[PDB]
Structure formats: C-alpha cells, structure tokens
Design a protein around this nucleic acid. Structure first.
Ligand SMILES: Nc1ccn([C@H]2C[C@H](O)[C@@H](COP(=O)(O)OP(=O)(O)OP(=O)(O)O)O2)c(=O)n1
Ligand SMILES: [Cl-]
Ligand SMILES: [Cl-]
Ligand SMILES: [Cl-]
Ligand SMILES: [Cl-]
Ligand SMILES: [Mg+2]
Ligand SMILES: [Mg+2]
Ligand SMILES: [Mg+2]
Ligand code: NA
Ligand code: NA
Ligand code: NA
Ligand code: NA
Ligand code: NA
Ligand code: NA
Length: 326
DNA sequence: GTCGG
DNA sequence: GCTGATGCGCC
DNA sequence: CCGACGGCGCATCAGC
C-alpha cells in the first residue's frame, strides 16, 4: 500500500482500456507503469518523480499529479458514472465473456447477472459455466484449501502412472496466502520435444480426476491444455466448498524449466522478463529460450538445466518464485 | 501509452 | 478440410 | 496512418 492510491488508479485505467476501449496496448502500458511504481521503494511525491521510471510517460505523470493533488482522477469519476462502461466492465468478469462479447451483450440490453440468467440461450457452454459459478469464481482460495487440492491432484495422478510429475504453479508456487485458481504443470517421460510415445497422456489424468468427482466441468480441452472446474469434498451439515477454476498444462519433460518459469508467473513478471530477453537478443516462451537472428528469426533452443539458467542468459539476478509477484 | 529505431 | 484472423483464456 | 509492444493453447468463423 506504499503508493497504493496510484497503483489502484492505474489498474482501474488498465481494465477500462482492455475491457471497454479494447485497447490492449494501453492496458499493457498501464499494467507496466503500475508494476514499476509498486516496486519503487519511496513515496511518490510528484508526476515528475514518477516520469523517471521506465513505462511512466507524460500522460501518466499528469494523472499522478492530479491524483496527488486531489485524491481522485476526474477521468475515472466519469468512467464510473457511465452505466454502459460499468456494465461492459462487469460482464467481462464472467469466465468466457471477453470485451467483444460484453459489448455485444450490452448493445442488446443484457447488462446484469439477472439478464444473463434470463438469456442463457445466448451463451455458449463456457459462458454458461462462468455464469453458474460466478460468485464462487470471484472468491480466492485460502492456501490451506490449495494444500488439500494439491493433495488430491498429486494422489490421483500417482494412481494413473507414478512416472507423472505434477507441480502446482501460479500464485501458490509464489508463496501466496491465497490464490485465484489452481494451476497444475504436468510432465511424463513419454512426452518430450523429440516424441509423443503415448497417446492421451493429459486425457488419462483429467478422466481420473473426473472419476473421483474432483473435476466437475470442462471449459476447454486439447492435447496439452485443460481448463475446467473442480471442487473439494465437504462434510455433512457443512456449507459446501466453492467450485474453483483449475488449469492443467502438459509440458514436454525436457522443457520443464521454461514451462515452470512460464506457469509460475506472475503475468507481468513474465511479460517484463520476456521484454528484457528481446532487448538482450533472445526470445522466451513456455518451451524454449532461443537467440534471435538478423531476420528477427529465433534460432535453435539453448540448453537449460534450471530456472536460473534462463535468468543467466539475459543477465538478470535470479528471482525466487516469491519475488516474482507484483 | 510509452519508448526507441 | 485448409490457412489466417478473431475471441476466449493462461502465466 | 511510426510501429513494436510477450507469447501461445483452444474454439470458432471467413474465405477458399
Ligand atoms: N519519434 C518519432 C516521431 C515521428 N515519427 C514519424 C512521423 C512521420 O510519419 C515521420 C516523419 O515525421 P516528421 O515530418 O514529423 O519528422 P521530422 O523529423 O521531419 O520533423 P521536424 O520537421 O520537426 O524535424 O516520422 C517517428 O517515426 N518517430
Ligand atoms: Cl491499444
Ligand atoms: Cl464453449
Ligand atoms: Cl527447459
Ligand atoms: Cl519453441
Ligand atoms: Mg492462478
Ligand atoms: Mg489459472
Ligand atoms: Mg491470473
Ligand atoms: Na519514464
Ligand atoms: Na471474462
Ligand atoms: Na499428499
Ligand atoms: Na472441447
Ligand atoms: Na453442488
Ligand atoms: Na546457473
């Protein structure tokens, strides 16, 4: 909450730009400024001071000066008073409704949860699930519950094949006291960059987790990525646990370090790390780090034996997972 | 919106 | 069906 | 209409 006012303002502007303006690069510019400001170890006392930071320019510095002088931003006052903008922003909170579908729904008079519930026939399966569990998906998951969830997942995966290794990533791996959802990175020796020596490696795991009633709904599913819904079991007389979002990603076993780096995040850390790789002459994805050639083309994958090796290539001091949060 | 070629 | 674009989502 | 900006999986649609 050092500079909390400012980073909250910038985050609200980011979400407006993404969700209402459909300006993804302005969204990213506000996210980067908010990130650099949140890590700054002093109280910001002027826009000029802020402007010294990378990603803060003239326009954001002017907003910082207004906020600092008044405790508000007139631009955000106006946005919050705009019913249309507020409804569009709100609908994007439903899983499976993005900025385009939100604008379409709002253009047709669908502006509230009640409206969506009355017009379910206009929603695809994903969106119906997002609507059904809307309240539940708004809630964070206490780390204590993430531990029970981890226990179930690792137990069931072991049952299918003891050679699978499942690693809970995302904010959990970063040490967070609560998480938005569960992210599971999966490997198996039969799936590498060289071969797929077994079929349906992800399917087998998903199927076992459905058999024991942990996974309750599927949003999307291909050969390497599963996106769905799960729920802890609860006791008699007791309030049910909320349904939770779960993501499972099967990554080639020989590309585990790029995979776990990607899946640990945070999102802004990843984008910032990948941006630094580009200015250092490299490109990073969840599979590989490659050098860039004269044609801007990525060359062959470089050898990696740890998360730190990836940091080494781009001359960043190693950051532990807990220091990768915003 | 910011930065850099 | 394909390629390529768009829309959803993930970190 | 300076253009890049991090990078990609899954689902669906446009123009073949
Ligand atoms: N930092 C910038 C600023 C502008 N442009 C673009 C905008 C124009 O399409 C083109 C040339 O525009 P100008 O005529 O504004 O650039 P000059 O250098 O000719 O302007 P001046 O007459 O001020 O020197 O470059 C650019 O690539 N990079
Ligand atoms: Cl944009
Ligand atoms: Cl769907
Ligand atoms: Cl790797
Ligand atoms: Cl690759
Ligand atoms: Mg997560
Ligand atoms: Mg997730
Ligand atoms: Mg997230
Ligand atoms: Na700056
Ligand atoms: Na959404
Ligand atoms: Na356990
Ligand atoms: Na599907
Ligand atoms: Na239920
Ligand atoms: Na090293």
């Amino acid at each position: 909450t050092l500079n909390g006012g400012i980073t909250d303002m910038l985050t609200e502007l980011a979400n407006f730009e993404k969700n209402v303006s459909q300006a993804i690069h302005k969204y990213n510019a506000y996210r980067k400024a908010a990130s650099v400001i949140a890590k700054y170890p002093h109280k910001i006392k002027s826009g000029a001071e802020a402007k010294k930071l990378p990603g803060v320019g003239t326009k954001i510095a002017e907003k910082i000066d207004e906020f600092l002088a008044t405790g508000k931003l007139r631009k955000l006052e106006k946005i919050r008073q705009d019913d249309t903008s507020s409804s569009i922003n709100f609908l994007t909170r439903v899983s499976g409704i993005g900025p385009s579908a939100a604008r379409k729904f709002v253009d047709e008079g669908i502006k509230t949860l009640e409206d969506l519930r009355k017009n379910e026939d206009k929603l695809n399966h994903h969106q119906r699930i997002g609507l059904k569990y809307f309240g539940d998906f708004e809630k964070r998951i206490p780390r204590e519950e993430m531990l029970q969830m981890q226990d179930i997942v690792l137990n069931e995966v072991k049952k299918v094949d003891s050679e699978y290794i499942a690693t809970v990533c995302g904010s959990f791996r970063r040490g967070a006291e609560s998480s938005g959802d569960m992210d599971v990175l999966l490997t198996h020796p039969s799936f590498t960059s060289e071969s797929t020596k077994q079929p349906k490696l992800l399917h087998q795991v998903v199927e076992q987790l459905q058999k024991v009633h942990f996974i309750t709904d599927t949003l999307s599913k291909g050969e390497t990525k599963f996106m769905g819904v799960c729920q802890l079991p609860s006791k008699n007389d007791e309030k049910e646990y909320p349904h939770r979002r779960i993501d499972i990603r099967l990554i080639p076993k020989d590309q585990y370090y790029c995979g776990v780096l990607y899946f640990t995040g945070s999102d802004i850390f990843n984008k910032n790390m990948r941006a630094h790789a580009l200015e250092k002459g490299f490109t990073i994805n969840e599979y590989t780090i490659r050098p860039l050639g004269v044609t801007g083309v990525a060359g062959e994958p470089l050898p990696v034996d740890s998360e730190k090796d990836i940091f080494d290539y781009i001359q960043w001091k190693y950051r532990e997972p807990k220091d990768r949060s915003e």
